[PDB]
Amino acid sequence: MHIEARLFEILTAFFALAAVVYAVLTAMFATGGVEWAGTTALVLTTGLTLITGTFFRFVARRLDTRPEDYEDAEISDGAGELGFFAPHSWWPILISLSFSTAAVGAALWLPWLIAAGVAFVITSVCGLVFEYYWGPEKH
Amino acid sequence: LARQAEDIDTRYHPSAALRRQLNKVFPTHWSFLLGEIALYSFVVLLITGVYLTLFFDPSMVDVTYNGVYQPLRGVEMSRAYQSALDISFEVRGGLFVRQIHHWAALMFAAAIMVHLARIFFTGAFRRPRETNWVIGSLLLILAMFEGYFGYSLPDDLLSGLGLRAALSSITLGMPVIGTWLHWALFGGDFPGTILIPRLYALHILLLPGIILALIGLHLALVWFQKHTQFPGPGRTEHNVVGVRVMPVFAFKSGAFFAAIVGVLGLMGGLLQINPIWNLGPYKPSQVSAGSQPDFYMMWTEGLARIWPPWEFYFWHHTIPAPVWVAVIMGLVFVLLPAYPFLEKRFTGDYAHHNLLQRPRDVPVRTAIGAMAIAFYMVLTLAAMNDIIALKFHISLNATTWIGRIGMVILPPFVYFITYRWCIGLQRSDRSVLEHGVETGIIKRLPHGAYIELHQPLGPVDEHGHPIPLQYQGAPLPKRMNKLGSAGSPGSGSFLFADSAAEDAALREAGHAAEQRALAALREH
Amino acid sequence: TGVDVEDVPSAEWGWSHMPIGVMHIGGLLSAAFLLVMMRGNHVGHVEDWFLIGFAAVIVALVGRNWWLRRRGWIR
Amino acid sequence: RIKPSDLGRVVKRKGQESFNFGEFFAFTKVCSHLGCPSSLYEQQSYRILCPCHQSQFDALHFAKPIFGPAARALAQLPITIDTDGYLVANGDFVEPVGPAFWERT
Amino acid sequence: SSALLRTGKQLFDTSCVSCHGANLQGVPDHGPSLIGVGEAAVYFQVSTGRMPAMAPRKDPIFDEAQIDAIGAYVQANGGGPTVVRNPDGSIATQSLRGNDLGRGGDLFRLNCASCHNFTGKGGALSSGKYAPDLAPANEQQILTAMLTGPQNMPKFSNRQLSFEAKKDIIAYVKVATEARQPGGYLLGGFGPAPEGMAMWIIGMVAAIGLALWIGARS
Amino acid sequence: LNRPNMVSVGTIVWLSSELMFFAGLFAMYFTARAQAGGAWPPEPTELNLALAVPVTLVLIASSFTCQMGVFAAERGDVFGLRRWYVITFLMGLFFVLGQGYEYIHLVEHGTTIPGSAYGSVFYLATGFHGLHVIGGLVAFVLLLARTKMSKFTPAQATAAIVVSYYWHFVDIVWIALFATIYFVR
Numbered sequence A: 001m002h003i004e005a006r007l008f009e010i011l012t013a014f015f016a017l018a019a020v021v022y023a024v025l026t027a028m029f030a031t032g033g034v035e036w037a038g039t040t041a042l043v044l045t046t047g048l049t050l051i052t053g054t055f056f057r058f059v060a061r062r063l064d065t066r067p068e069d070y071e072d073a074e075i076s077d078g079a080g081e082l083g084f085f086a087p088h089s090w091w092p093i094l095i096s097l098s099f100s101t102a103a104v105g106a107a108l109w110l111p112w113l114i115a116a117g118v119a120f121v122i123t124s125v126c127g128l129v130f131e132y133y134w135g136p137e138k139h
Numbered sequence B: 001l002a003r004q005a006e007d008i009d010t011r012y013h014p015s016a017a018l019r020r021q022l023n024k025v026f027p028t029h030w031s032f033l034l035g036e037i038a039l040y041s042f043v044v045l046l047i048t049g050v051y052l053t054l055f056f057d058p059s060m061v062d063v064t065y066n067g068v069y070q071p072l073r074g075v076e077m078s079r080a081y082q083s084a085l086d087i088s089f090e091v092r093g094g095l096f097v098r099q100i101h102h103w104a105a106l107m108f109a110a111a112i113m114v115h116l117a118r119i120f121f122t123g124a125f126r127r128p129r130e131t132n133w134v135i136g137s138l139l140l141i142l143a144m145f146e147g148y149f150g151y152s153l154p155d156d157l158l159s160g161l162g163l164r165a166a167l168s169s170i171t172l173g174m175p176v177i178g179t180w181l182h183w184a185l186f187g188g189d190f191p192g193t194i195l196i197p198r199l200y201a202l203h204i205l206l207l208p209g210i211i212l213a214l215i216g217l218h219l220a221l222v223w224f225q226k227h228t229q230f231p232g233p234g235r236t237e238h239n240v241v242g243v244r245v246m247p248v249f250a251f252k253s254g255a256f257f258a259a260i261v262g263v264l265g266l267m268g269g270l271l272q273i274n275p276i277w278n279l280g281p282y283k284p285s286q287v288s289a290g291s292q293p294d295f296y297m298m299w300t301e302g303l304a305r306i307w308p309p310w311e312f313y314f315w316h317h318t319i320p321a322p323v324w325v326a327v328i329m330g331l332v333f334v335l336l337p338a339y340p341f342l343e344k345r346f347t348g349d350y351a352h353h354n355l356l357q358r359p360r361d362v363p364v365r366t367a368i369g370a371m372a373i374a375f376y377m378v379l380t381l382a383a384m385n386d387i388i389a390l391k392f393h394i395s396l397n398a399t400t401w402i403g404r405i406g407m408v409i410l411p412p413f414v415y416f417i418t419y420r421w422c423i424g425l426q427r428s429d430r431s432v433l434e435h436g437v438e439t440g441i442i443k444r445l446p447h448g449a450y451i452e453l454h455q456p457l458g459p460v461d462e463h464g465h466p467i468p469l470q471y472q473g474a475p476l477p478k479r480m481n482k483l484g485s486a487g488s489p490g491s492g493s494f495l496f497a498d499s500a501a502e503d504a505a506l507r508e509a510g511h512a513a514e515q516r517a518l519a520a521l522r523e524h
Numbered sequence C: 001t002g003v004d005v006e007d008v009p010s011a012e013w014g015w016s017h018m019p020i021g022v023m024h025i026g027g028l029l030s031a032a033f034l035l036v037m038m039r040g041n042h043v044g045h046v047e048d049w050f051l052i053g054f055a056a057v058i059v060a061l062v063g064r065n066w067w068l069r070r071r072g073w074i075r
Numbered sequence D: 001r002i003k004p005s006d007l008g009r010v011v012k013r014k015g016q017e018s019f020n021f022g023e024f025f026a027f028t029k030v031c032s033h034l035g036c037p038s039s040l041y042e043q044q045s046y047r048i049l050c051p052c053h054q055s056q057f058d059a060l061h062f063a064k065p066i067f068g069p070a071a072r073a074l075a076q077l078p079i080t081i082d083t084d085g086y087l088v089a090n091g092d093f094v095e096p097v098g099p100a101f102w103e104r105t
Numbered sequence E: 001s002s003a004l005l006r007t008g009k010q011l012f013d014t015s016c017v018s019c020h021g022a023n024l025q026g027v028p029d030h031g032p033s034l035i036g037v038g039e040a041a042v043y044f045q046v047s048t049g050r051m052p053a054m055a056p057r058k059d060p061i062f063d064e065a066q067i068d069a070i071g072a073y074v075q076a077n078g079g080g081p082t083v084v085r086n087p088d089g090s091i092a093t094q095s096l097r098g099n100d101l102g103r104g105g106d107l108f109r110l111n112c113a114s115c116h117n118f119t120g121k122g123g124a125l126s127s128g129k130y131a132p133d134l135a136p137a138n139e140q141q142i143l144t145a146m147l148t149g150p151q152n153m154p155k156f157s158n159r160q161l162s163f164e165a166k167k168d169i170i171a172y173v174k175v176a177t178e179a180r181q182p183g184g185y186l187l188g189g190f191g192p193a194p195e196g197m198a199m200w201i202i203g204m205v206a207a208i209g210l211a212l213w214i215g216a217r218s
Numbered sequence F: 001l002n003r004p005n006m007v008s009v010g011t012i013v014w015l016s017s018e019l020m021f022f023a024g025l026f027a028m029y030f031t032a033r034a035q036a037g038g039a040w041p042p043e044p045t046e047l048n049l050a051l052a053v054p055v056t057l058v059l060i061a062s063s064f065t066c067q068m069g070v071f072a073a074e075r076g077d078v079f080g081l082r083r084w085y086v087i088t089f090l091m092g093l094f095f096v097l098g099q100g101y102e103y104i105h106l107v108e109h110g111t112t113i114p115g116s117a118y119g120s121v122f123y124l125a126t127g128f129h130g131l132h133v134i135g136g137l138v139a140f141v142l143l144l145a146r147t148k149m150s151k152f153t154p155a156q157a158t159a160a161i162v163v164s165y166y167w168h169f170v171d172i173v174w175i176a177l178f179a180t181i182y183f184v185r
């Protein structure tokens, strides 16, 4: 993919420019020196876009043309078998209930509720991860 | 031991009843152990209570403590409270034993309730078994009252408040008999001298005896009317498919017994229940904030809390409010044992039944049961008003009114949702019967179309679509991995692999044995 | 009693019909019971308005169902 | 003991107008529902709360119940002082104390 | 330098006059008079943090001997009770612990346990209000609490509850909040509700999980 | 079909968002260091560098072990994967135990969360990283248990790879935190 990488490179360039400009303009001309709270956010949003763009760049350099990236193409090119898309599942609502229990137990300071919520989150996430890998029962 | 076995055989010659009992077949469903749980809890209760009777003194005479527990020295208390304190602090391992006793009582009640839920929802109470249902209901009532009389024995402040309020002042208010019952039971006015010995005699001798007789009768009826079963591949109304007692079933039952005893010991050692020393001896002038009976009487307490103050005053007389609680509790206790006859009168079905129903195939009964469970949960939560309003910052009057209104609007809402949910499950089953099992794989079909690659459960027609099956009351698979689709991991241990020959041989013999089991059970 | 299979697929495997008169009368009775609960020691009227508001919704639903069933739009 | 500030919001039930001695009132402590000690007293709402099932009586209105399954008022005891300055009882309750039964309150 | 309450009436004027008045007169909208009250009321209300209020317990705003400043300034305008002091002039902590726990516990169960608990946990009152937990309050706070009678809590004078009685109650409270549970993990201090919950959510799930493991499903 | 991996893209963008979270925490830390003039680590607080070096080297060795496990996973054998991931789990557990020990020995005689500003920002910055490490440990255990229950397919390889570079992100942000707190001061 060539255009996504270019988008992220544009964003990273602008963010780095803005971060450096803000840092050096608040080093002077400011009440107490460098501002130290917007500077950090700016360098690390630059780092975010940089990470994403670099990953996309490597994947693009390690890839041959794709029917999506390619113009000139027809629908007989993508004829094949896509991945695995999960049909019906009921684990998400249980995960959300467990996380909400832990959150309300953290709002009102109740340690037992926090412990129960964490245990339920571990259980529900385990159920979600193993859903399509449990084998038949051994009897 | 040939000599001993033969001499037993010429003196008794059973040799045929033993063979008839060693070949009995029992179905193997995880849901058929919820009664074993209650049975094992009862056994543990018997053992620990027999241990406890060697140290308890059930008197109501007053003494001064003069013991080892210092923050209570010089306080005047009854003899039962002092005996309980002596069990707790002066016998090596007594606190552990009474904590096991209380935890086992709680597990007894909970297991009974879960077992009743199973029996009701699967429909195992129909024509041949109404009387067994009735015996079970009586056992439930007796267990409730036995636990109550039990935790009211070491008379401290909480037990005293419970006794006073419930027993004394609800028996005192009955319309005509009333005070006569109160004086026959207490020997006089509320704080007497014969209450605790009478409760002790009722609790260690009478109710355990009645419960033991009823449990014997229950298990006999279950043994001679063979167990029910779920519909399946080789199951009919005329046979029992499972495992014989001889090698397997006794083994599984004993292992389950040991595991339940282990759980009870662990949670009787690690969690604290009923610390009577933090309380004080019962005195009619002081009170605390919790109140609260054990969780199997909380519905009675909640019903007393959220019932409005409706009294009737006519000529020279008075009918107080707790009369309402009395008739409602009696109505519940009368409507529980008489349900199978009501259902057979209303549906008009009087045939023998040995195959169970899935709860999704009977929407109306499932909705009724869900409504009753919602009602019970509302009544139980209305009993911990103080704790809820204190921990979660809610008004107290707010919780009272929430319970008072929920008592009317939650059951019907639950009924509606449960009915619609059951029918939705039925439709989801019919869809996988008509088509195949969804695999989750997508294709693009060169003229840009997306299909999803179902997998048939039976034969197929000329153009690849499966011919629809018929429903047979048995569950259907929904995930491709539950059918053998992606399996067979390596055959190492956890970090080092085995040889290839061993892996191939084990995999291949396992596959063969699976196929043979399937083909054998189909054909019968 | 009887229900067609196209509404309840497993209509021959168990009880699946409850007559509608039971539901209508039960709704009316529950509304009446909510109303009669203004007799007591309620000083303050914040609670009475919830009783009146929940008894109007039940009556509205019961009346809607009855009127639609009477004109054939349902069943 | 009622604060002298209010002493004007008292209602004084029909038969017990002289059962109080100044700012002392001396109601009973056995709840008129099922007999638990109604000991929770809120000093500036003048409400008595029974902790067993949460009834509420109005200490300024002859202990009239204003919440819950409680339906009858708490009994009041007449008090006075003797020739030495100690608090004594000026008689007996006008009615039975505690829960009700078939015969009467 | 006791003739210095110019501090005191420097903090009150900038943190209290909007709800009590410039002359401690009780703005007829929000606050009470604060004239008959003394140093003990101010100490209990500010040290626990219930004071200056936007009433729950919060973090305190004032120390570095300014609780003394406001207390002396308020005591100079009335005759309320005063805070106990040790031979150094500081507030007594250790001298307010009695030596008899039986009498203290009996007095607690008769007078105090109705609203709080058997062992000093919380309790719920009507329409909002509750009775807090007695664990984090120190000794002088307990004494001044039962001496000044804060909102909706009764007032126990030194004539109906003598000073020994108060010291013994303090000792019982401080011992009941700091003793072990010699039976395992206590489930919060309350009765059978946490016990029933722990049963249903530990023992029954263990039993049903083992039943699912042992027995087949069909 | 699907020449670039999907789980990879998802994990990458999520790791970017997590970086922004830690940015917020860093911004909290740098302020209140500009205000404290002089010995801005207060007198009762001084950091024991004799313990913070070994745990950092242990974490770096963990990163190496995880990369070796992924190398073993890309060729379809489960046992090399299992061995290297068990080693990584053990080293991460050792790191967490060392961090907890330093917390104990440092709260013993001084610095607390409600007792200072430096202690507040220090505990807040390092405890969230500890929570992330614990989450990574849970992910390792779940992945091993999942490889135990079916045959090895490319999906298992993809899961291993994404868990791997989550771990890498964790032990890189740790290097950042360490160099900022213990040396720069």
Ligand SMILES: CC(C)=CCC/C(C)=C/CC/C(C)=C\CC/C(C)=C/CC/C(C)=C/CC/C(C)=C/CC/C(C)=C\CC/C(C)=C\CC/C(C)=C/CC1=C(C)C(=O)c2ccccc2C1=O
Residues within 6 Å of the ligand: B113, B114, B116, B117, B120, B295, B299, B332, B335, B336, B339, B369, B372, B373, B375, B376, B380, E193, E196, E197, E200, E201, E204, E205, E208
């Ligand atoms: C099945 C149905 C009850 C039969 C109906 C037959 C006929 C209608 C009889 C009429 C009865 C009607 C009129 C009134 C009902 C109320 C009355 C009968 C009460 C008597 C007691 C008896 C009948 C018990 C009813 C059945 C019982 C409640 C089964 C519930 C348990 C089952 C279904 C699921 C349990 C699964 C369990 C392992 C996980 C649940 C986890 C927790 C949240 C369970 C919930 C929970 C419970 C259930 C507590 O009791 C509890 C008590 C104290 C503190 C907390 C809790 C608590 O959290």
Ligand code: HEC
Residues within 6 Å of the ligand: E011, E012, E015, E016, E018, E019, E020, E030, E031, E032, E034, E037, E041, E042, E045, E046, E051, E052, E053, E054, E055, E070, E148, E149, E150, E151
């Ligand atoms: C209007 C907001 C408000 C502010 C600001 C405020 N108070 Fe209060 N104060 C109240 C209210 C309302 C009460 C009534 C007590 C209650 O109901 O809890 C009260 C009660 C008191 C009491 C106890 C009264 C009694 O009779 O026992 C004292 C003492 C007190 N305040 C002093 C202070 C002090 C010291 C400050 C800090 C300079 C302060 N107040 C600031 C509102 C306020």
Ligand code: HEC
Residues within 6 Å of the ligand: D040, D041, D042, E048, E050, E055, E056, E057, E108, E111, E112, E113, E114, E115, E116, E125, E129, E130, E131, E132, E133, E134, E135, E136, E137, E141, E142, E145, E146, E150, E151, E152, E153, E154, E156, E169
């Ligand atoms: C239900 C009536 C009631 C009685 C009786 C009662 N309390 Fe209180 N108590 C309260 C209320 C309400 C508060 C909260 C006052 C506030 O927050 O301003 C409180 C507060 C307290 C506090 C402050 C707790 C804290 O953490 O700051 C202590 C200490 C205390 N009471 C001790 C006692 C003692 C000792 C007794 C027995 C002599 C007693 N109480 C009797 C209701 C009561």
Ligand code: HEM
Residues within 6 Å of the ligand: B042, B045, B046, B048, B049, B050, B052, B053, B056, B084, B087, B098, B099, B101, B102, B105, B108, B143, B146, B147, B150, B151, B152, B153, B154, B203, B204, B208, B211, B274
């Ligand atoms: C069968 C069902 C039983 C139930 C539900 C039950 C329940 C209880 C409970 C909850 C207690 C309170 C214990 C405590 O709080 O310390 C108790 C006390 C007691 N139980 Fe049981 N019990 C049963 C059977 C038995 C049996 C069969 C015996 C004797 C053979 C027995 C002997 C005792 C004794 C002596 C006490 C009082 C000792 C004490 O309180 O420490 N119980 N019972």
Ligand SMILES: CCc1nc2ccc(Cl)cn2c1C(=O)NCc1ccc(N2CCC(c3ccc(OC(F)(F)F)cc3)CC2)cc1
Residues within 6 Å of the ligand: B148, B158, B159, B161, B162, B163, B165, B166, B167, B170, B171, B174, B181, B291, B292, B293, B297, B300, B301, B304, B326, D052
């Ligand atoms: C209000 C309940 C309650 N509040 C609190 C508050 C605090 C605490 Cl700690 C506990 N509680 C509880 C409490 O303990 N609830 C359990 C309970 C409830 C009722 C009964 N029953 C006894 C026999 C009666 C009876 C007996 C014979 C009769 O004669 C006839 F007609 F022939 F049958 C009629 C009625 C009925 C009620 C037992 C236990």
Ligand code: FES
Residues within 6 Å of the ligand: B165, D031, D032, D033, D034, D035, D036, D038, D050, D051, D052, D053, D054, D055, D070
């Ligand atoms: S006992 Fe006082 S309210 Fe029922």
